[PDB]
């Protein structure tokens, strides 16, 4: 059916939105390395900021896996 | 997606509330941290001899 077929392309396309979090997470844990190499005494406070950035970044990434599964199964 | 099966949702909502909000909390209350004991060796309400 043209609907069951289009659900595969639509769910496949919306998954590309995860590529944004693959790159955004690399920047956070990349800046944590740079930021910790300069002021290693703030290690515990820096890491607190990395997790906050990691969460907010991957948040936008799962909103895509949301629609990817909202289309594939919930429709 | 079984997550979207809204018929058994009440089977997950209640016991979580019975676990996150009652039981586990009732075990943290039973994990108390006492102030460490450093009673100072300087406590003497004294006074000069009677003059």
UniProtKB/Swiss-Prot annotation, chain A:
Subcellular location: Mitochondrion membrane
Keywords: CF(0), Hydrogen ion transport, Ion transport, Lipid-binding, Membrane, Methylation, Mitochondrion, Transit peptide, Transmembrane, Transmembrane helix, Transport
Modified residues (N6,N6,N6-trimethyllysine): 43
tRNA processing listed as a keyword: no
Transit peptide found in the keyword field: yes
Site (Reversibly protonated during proton transport): 58
Post-translational modification: Trimethylated by ATPSCKMT at Lys-43. Methylation is required for proper incorporation of the C subunit into the ATP synthase complex and mitochondrial respiration.
Principal place of residence: mitochondrion
Membrane topology qualifier: Multi-pass membrane protein
Any single GO BP term: proton motive force-driven ATP synthesis
One cellular component term from this protein's GO annotations in UniProt: mitochondrion
GO molecular function: lipid binding; proton channel activity
Source superkingdom: Eukaryota
Transmembrane feature ranges: 16-36, 51-71
Catalyzed reactions per annotation: H(+)(in) = H(+)(out)
UniProt record similarity statement: Belongs to the ATPase C chain family.
Quaternary structure (record): Homooctamer; the c-ring consists of eight c subunits forming a circle, and each subunit adopts a hairpin shape. Component of the ATP synthase complex composed at least of ATP5F1A/subunit alpha, ATP5F1B/subunit beta, ATP5MC1/subunit c (homooctomer), MT-ATP6/subunit a, MT-ATP8/subunit 8, ATP5ME/subunit e, ATP5MF/subunit f, ATP5MG/subunit g, ATP5MK/subunit k, ATP5MJ/subunit j, ATP5F1C/subunit gamma, ATP5F1D/subunit delta, ATP5F1E/subunit epsilon, ATP5PF/subunit F6, ATP5PB/subunit b, ATP5PD/subunit d, ATP5PO/subunit OSCP.
Record function comment: Subunit c, of the mitochondrial membrane ATP synthase complex (F(1)F(0) ATP synthase or Complex V) that produces ATP from ADP in the presence of a proton gradient across the membrane which is generated by electron transport complexes of the respiratory chain. ATP synthase complex consist of a soluble F(1) head domain - the catalytic core - and a membrane F(1) domain - the membrane proton channel. These two domains are linked by a central stalk rotating inside the F(1) region and a stationary peripheral stalk.
Extra remark: There are three genes which encode the mitochondrial ATP synthase proteolipid and they specify precursors with different import sequences but identical mature proteins. Is the major protein stored in the storage bodies of animals or humans affected with ceroid lipofuscinosis (Batten disease).
Listed name of the protein: ATP synthase F(0) complex subunit C1, mitochondrial
Full-protein residues shown: 62 to 136 of 136
Swiss-Prot record, chain B:
Keywords of this entry: Acetylation, ATP synthesis, Cardiomyopathy, CF(0), Disease variant, Hydrogen ion transport, Ion transport, Membrane, Mitochondrion, Primary mitochondrial disease, Transmembrane, Transmembrane helix, Transport
Subcellular compartments: Mitochondrion membrane
Transmembrane spans: 8-21
Keyword Transport: yes
GO biological-process terms attached to the record: proton motive force-driven ATP synthesis; proton motive force-driven mitochondrial ATP synthesis
One Gene Ontology cellular component: mitochondrion
Alphabetized GO MF terms: proton transmembrane transporter activity
Membrane topology: Single-pass membrane protein
Assembly and oligomerization: Component of the ATP synthase complex composed at least of ATP5F1A/subunit alpha, ATP5F1B/subunit beta, ATP5MC1/subunit c (homooctomer), MT-ATP6/subunit a, MT-ATP8/subunit 8, ATP5ME/subunit e, ATP5MF/subunit f, ATP5MG/subunit g, ATP5MK/subunit k, ATP5MJ/subunit j, ATP5F1C/subunit gamma, ATP5F1D/subunit delta, ATP5F1E/subunit epsilon, ATP5PF/subunit F6, ATP5PB/subunit b, ATP5PD/subunit d, ATP5PO/subunit OSCP.
Task of the protein: Subunit 8, of the mitochondrial membrane ATP synthase complex (F(1)F(0) ATP synthase or Complex V) that produces ATP from ADP in the presence of a proton gradient across the membrane which is generated by electron transport complexes of the respiratory chain. ATP synthase complex consist of a soluble F(1) head domain - the catalytic core - and a membrane F(1) domain - the membrane proton channel. These two domains are linked by a central stalk rotating inside the F(1) region and a stationary peripheral stalk.
The family this protein is said to belong to: Belongs to the ATPase protein 8 family.
Medical condition linked: Mitochondrial complex V deficiency, mitochondrial 2: A mitochondrial disorder with heterogeneous clinical manifestations including neuropathy, ataxia, hypertrophic cardiomyopathy. Hypertrophic cardiomyopathy can present with negligible to extreme hypertrophy, minimal to extensive fibrosis and myocyte disarray, absent to severe left ventricular outflow tract obstruction, and distinct septal contours/morphologies with extremely varying clinical course. Cardiomyopathy, infantile hypertrophic: An infantile form of hypertrophic cardiomyopathy, a heart disorder characterized by ventricular hypertrophy, which is usually asymmetric and often involves the interventricular septum. The symptoms include dyspnea, syncope, collapse, palpitations, and chest pain. They can be readily provoked by exercise. The disorder has inter- and intrafamilial variability ranging from benign to malignant forms with high risk of cardiac failure and sudden cardiac death.
Name listed for the protein in its UniProt record: ATP synthase F(0) complex subunit 8
Species whose genome carries this gene: Homo sapiens (Human)
Residue span relative to the full protein: 1 to 51 of 68
